[PDB]
Design an enzyme around this catalytic site. Structure first.
Site: not given
Ligand code: FCO
Ligand code: NI
Ligand code: SF4
Ligand code: SF4
Ligand code: F3S
Ligand SMILES: [Mg+2]
Lengths: 263, 544
Positions: B20, B67, B70, B74, B471, B494, B538, B541
């Site tokens: 991502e 994102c 995922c 969030h 993640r 990330s 990602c 993210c």
């Molecule tokens: N899983 C996921 Fe996205 C990332 N890095 C988030 O929080």
């Molecule tokens: Ni993500």
């Protein structure tokens, strides 16, 4: 035999990959069938095998294809500092998207970000994000929503390959999918008409599935097909007891907020 | 004998595809081994800036768009965040529903990661065309569980489709693949390539089902719309017919996990055992997930069924508790203004300042999160080590099994191979727990359907939302002032794994993991991809 399939280049700019994800939820056809039998998806950072220079080269081969290509853009374009806040391969995203657009047979903006600027353009817009048509100065077929229904996106893609550019509204949306208000097809409409609103999410009214207008629902000013086609063959936000955010309208981040109010 | 060239000099891979978001990776290589590394995130959006002065109820809807892969997590972290700030304890049913949606997310996200983003680093798709589909059926019949998808006939039909696709001359997503014409670093037998490729296609269909499952509770996918301050909005999600459909879909997804994902993972791991000695890091952090008590951040950390914890120096005998006041973000090597180092997220600052590409002093849109001055790896491998170290019964059983099937020691898990295996390990565990969690909510929902609690917006307050996302350790931090967002900071898995060096010049997890990466072919450095992809990066993210 060997029937040539139309070349599609898909660019990711300032985006969250939610549009790519939505596209791959298509079941008519499934994404495998689409890229094996219908189009030739020739650049797509999320899933392509090549990386780096190999990837860059595949893009430039697709762009120079004797047969031309269609352009799919996911995401807005950050334009501050010469567009250096959003780069791929050491090039500003505005610059690559510009270059791919010059020669595209057509440009499809997948999602609210590409179409209209999306979440990064919301005040105070630190990256000076624009939508494609604005950044580039070219007409785009807009498939908005955050993200759009794959039925809307694949339908548009198929439609442009096999019939032509479809009828668009004032905001560049195919009238096939965006011609009707969410609110006009909402099962909670009779509640709205009888002024039967849930005042909070904990209320018995919420339990009884009363209208969500008083909890900020933007169904009445949003054009999309959500209650008609649903998502994932099973659901949509209001069925899940949540007001519409108006996510298929331009700049909705600023025009539809506060989300839980109507003010 | 791990293939390795004699290449000395720089390699840049940009874009890093099959992740991502927008990542540039720079390495210095000497005698075919990576000797230095930079993780350079190439996009800024600035959600945190965007949120300043807005309605705290609105945050979950903005932040969810950090994102789309995922998706949900969030919105979940924001809701936990604001719930904490307003001091509302969500109903039992809400906890259950929010947690089950997270479970569905792990399933969908992990399945797509292995097959559609990770596998092409290990599987040579073109070499599948060389398999005999009878010999490949026999091979699949001898390793994996019995299934019609694995029959000579089905594998042949996959082979035939792929054949007409390659012979068309339009290779599409395979154009310029690092495996084209063979590659020293790709070890799989053609038969294995064919089996994995069949499953790659199957997975494209199966992930639709995973998302449907998720949508029954989440309202839609991507970008769910069922969480509210004080709980959830989805009364229908507590009802019988939708829950029976949710279960049925979940079992189909999990059958494919057990039948295809895990066995493919283990075959891959068996052939690439050498990768158990590449890409290791030392410190692991998790906030935990799937808690029996989400009334507060403290309760979340204490009662997460995938436990929270901190491991330092690979020491599995000393799992420490998470000190939320010990988290901070540096910006010294990031594209932000001077003077922002050492910030706890409640005092976080997001004042972007670009310089130029490959400025070694400022080379990423990511901040560098640190824990008492240490970089921390988060995600399935972190969750796995912490759970294993605490004797969590599922993790111990599955991990010890994986170890037994592969014939490697637990220390082989501190590696890219380990990182990859962990991801599948927790997927089988989530799968083993689905029926129990669904029954718990079905039963509770039928007794009483309370799903959102009353709450009041405070003039002034702070709150934190924790989740362990696919993640890793995710935290959202709010300061409310004048009943509005005064500050809202995201610190994302990330960011932990892929950010740049901290204020001490200390490499992040991915930068460290890349040191000692062998490069068989500098023109086609798949090994770089193997390790970076193993972290499931990602950037959207990471930078938000
Ligand atoms: N899983 C996921 Fe996205 C990332 N890095 C988030 O929080
Ligand atoms: Ni993500
Ligand atoms: S339109 Fe929405 S889902 Fe699509 S890229 Fe933008 S933020 Fe993501
Ligand atoms: S819930 Fe929204 S879309 Fe449905 S009737 Fe009420 S205001 Fe309209
Ligand atoms: S928020 Fe968006 S997805 Fe449909 S219900 Fe409203 S337009
Ligand atoms: Mg942040």
């Amino acid at each position: 035999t060997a029937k040539h399939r139309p070349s599609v280049v898909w660019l990711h700019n300032a985006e969250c990959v939610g549009c790519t994800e939505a596209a791959i939820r298509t079941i008519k056809p499934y994404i495998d069938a689409l890229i094996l039998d219908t189009i030739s998806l020739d650049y797509q950072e999320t899933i392509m095998a090549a990386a780096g220079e190999a990837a860059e080269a595949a893009l430039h081969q697709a762009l120079e294809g004797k047969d031309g290509y269609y352009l799919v853009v996911e995401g807005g374009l950050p334009t501050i500092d010469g567009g250096q806040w959003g780069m791929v391969a050491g090039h500003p995203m505005i610059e690559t998207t510009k270059k791919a657009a010059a020669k595209a047979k057509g440009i499809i903006c997948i999602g609210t970000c590409s179409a209209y600027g999306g979440v990064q353009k919301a005040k105070p817009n630190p990256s000076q994000a624009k939508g494609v048509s604005e950044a580039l100065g070219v007409k785009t077929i807009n498939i908005p929503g955050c993200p759009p229904n794959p039925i809307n996106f694949v339908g548009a893609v198929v439609h442009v390959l096999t019939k032509g550019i479809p009828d668009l509204d004032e905001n560049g949306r195919p009238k096939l999918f965006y011609g009707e208000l969410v609110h006009d097809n909402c099962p909670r409409l009779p509640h709205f008409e009888a002024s039967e609103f849930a005042p909070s999410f904990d209320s018995e009214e919420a339990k009884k599935g009363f209208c969500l207008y008083e909890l900020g629902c933007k169904g009445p000013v949003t054009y999309n097909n959500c209650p008609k086609v649903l998502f994932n063959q099973v659901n949509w936000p209001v069925q899940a007891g949540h007001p519409c955010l108006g996510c298929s309208e331009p700049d909705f981040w600023d025009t539809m907020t506060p989300f839980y109010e109507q003010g | 004998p791990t293939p390795q060239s004699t290449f000395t000099g720089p390699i840049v891979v940009d874009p890093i595809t099959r992740i991502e978001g927008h990542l540039r990776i720079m390495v210095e290589v000497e005698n075919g081994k990576v000797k230095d590394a930079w993780s350079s995130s190439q996009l800024f959006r600035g959600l945190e800036i965007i949120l300043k002065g807005r309605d705290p109820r609105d945050a979950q809807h903005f932040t969810q768009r950090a994102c789309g892969v995922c998706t949900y997590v969030h919105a979940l972290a924001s809701s936990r965040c604001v719930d904490d700030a307003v001091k509302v304890s969500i109903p039992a049913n809400a906890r259950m529903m929010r947690n089950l949606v997270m479970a569905s997310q792990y399933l969908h996200d992990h399945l797509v990661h292995f097959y559609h983003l990770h596998a092409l680093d290990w599987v040579d798709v073109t070499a599948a065309l060389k398999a005999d589909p009878n010999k490949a059926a026999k091979l699949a019949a001898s390793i994996a569980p019995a299934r019609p998808g694995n029959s000579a006939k089905a594998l042949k039909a996959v082979q035939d489709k792929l054949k007409a696709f390659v012979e068309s001359g339009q290779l599409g997503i395979f154009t310029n693949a690092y495996f084209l014409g063979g590659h020293k670093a790709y070890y799989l037998p053609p038969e294995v390539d064919l089996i994995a490729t069949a499953h790659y296609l199957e997975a494209l269909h199966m992930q639709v089902k995973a998302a449907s499952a998720m949508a029954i509770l989440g309202g839609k996918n991507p970008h769910t719309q069922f969480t509210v301050v004080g709980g959830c909005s989805n009364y229908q999600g507590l009802t019988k017919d939708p829950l029976a459909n949710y279960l049925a879909l979940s079992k189909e997804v999990c059958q494919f996990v057990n039948e295809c994902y895990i066995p493919d993972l283990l075959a891959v791991a068996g052939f690439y055992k050498d990768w158990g000695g590449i890409g290791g890091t030392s410190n692991y952090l998790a906030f935990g997930e799937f808690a029996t008590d989400d009334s507060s951040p403290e309760k979340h950390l204490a009662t997460s069924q995938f436990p929270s914890g901190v491991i330092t120096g690979r020491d599995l005998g000393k799992v420490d508790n998470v000190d939320l006041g010990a988290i901070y973000e540096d910006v010294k090597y990031s594209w932000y203004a001077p003077g922002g180092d050492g910030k706890h997220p409640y005092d976080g600052v997001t004042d972007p300042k670009y310089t130029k590409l490959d400025d070694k002093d400022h080379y990423s849109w990511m901040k560098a999160p640190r824990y008492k001055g240490k970089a921390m790896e988060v995600g399935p491998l972190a969750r796995t080590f912490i759970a294993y170290a605490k004797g969590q019964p599922d993790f111990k059983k599955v991990v010890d099994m994986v170890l037994g099937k592969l014939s490697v020691p637990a220390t082989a898990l501190h590696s890219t191979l380990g990182r990859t295996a962990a991801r599948g390990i927790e997927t089988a565990i989530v799968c083993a727990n689905m029926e129990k969690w669904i029954k718990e909510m079905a039963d509770s929902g039928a007794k009483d359907n309370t799903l959102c609690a009353k709450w009041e917006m405070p003039e002034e307050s702070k709150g934190v939302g924790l989740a362990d996302a696919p993640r890793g350790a995710l935290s959202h931090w709010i300061r409310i002032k004048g009943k509005k967002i005064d500050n809202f900071q995201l610190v994302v898995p990330s960011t932990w794994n892929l950010g740049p060096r901290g204020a001490q010049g200390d490499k992040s997890p991915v930068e460290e993991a890349l040191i000692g990466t062998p490069i068989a072919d500098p023109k086609r450095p798949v090994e770089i991809l193997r390790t970076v992809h193993a972290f499931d990066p990602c950037i959207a993210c990471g930078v938000h």
